[PDB]
């Protein structure tokens, strides 16, 4: 029940929904369900907008996947602006990375989605954690604006 652990659970839950890994009987939390619907509302459109760009990147490893994630995330927020919509795109992008990694990584570890979700949660809490605290948090700011 820590701050990083809750963000890690959200990041890992979404990758399970993207890869369509079945969870316990009932689905994840209501917060992860609101997040999954909003990020699904985005993901397929982002892929179909960046097919030329994504078809030319080599996401062949975890470090390689982390390098590209850090690179895109630093330029997206290079204006110093954070909102709940931009946070949704952080989850939407990790879903595209894990699908490119699944198709390009040779001999992956079991549950590689847990490794990708880990450094994705590190970025969210280190660079948007203080902002999330100051705009209602997850149960009062995010859910209450998309539900």
């Amino acid at each position: 029940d820590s701050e990083f652990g809750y963000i890690y659970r959200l990041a890992q839950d979404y990758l399970q929904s993207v890869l369509q890994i079945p969870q316990p009987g009932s689905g994840p939390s209501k917060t992860s369900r609101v997040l999954q619907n909003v990020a699904f509302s985005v993901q397929k459109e982002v892929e179909k907008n960046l097919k030329s760009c994504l078809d030319n990147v080599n996401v062949v490893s975890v470090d390689t996947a982390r390098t590209l994630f850090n690179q895109v995330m630093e330029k997206e927020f290079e204006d110093g602006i954070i909102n709940w919509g931009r946070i949704v795109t952080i989850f939407a992008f990790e879903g595209i990375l894990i699908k490119k990694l699944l198709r390009q990584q040779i001999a992956p570890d079991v549950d590689t989605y847990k490794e990708i979700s880990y450094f994705v949660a590190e970025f969210i809490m280190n660079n948007t954690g203080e902002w999330i605290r100051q705009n209602g948090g997850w149960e009062n700011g995010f859910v209450k604006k998309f539900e």
Binding site: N49, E74, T89, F93
Partner: peptide
């Protein structure tokens, strides 16, 4: 990153 940024602002409406 430009794409994702405006996809995000879009939903912030």
């Amino acid at each position: 990153x430009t794409x994702l940024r405006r996809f995000g602002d879009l939903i912030n409406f």
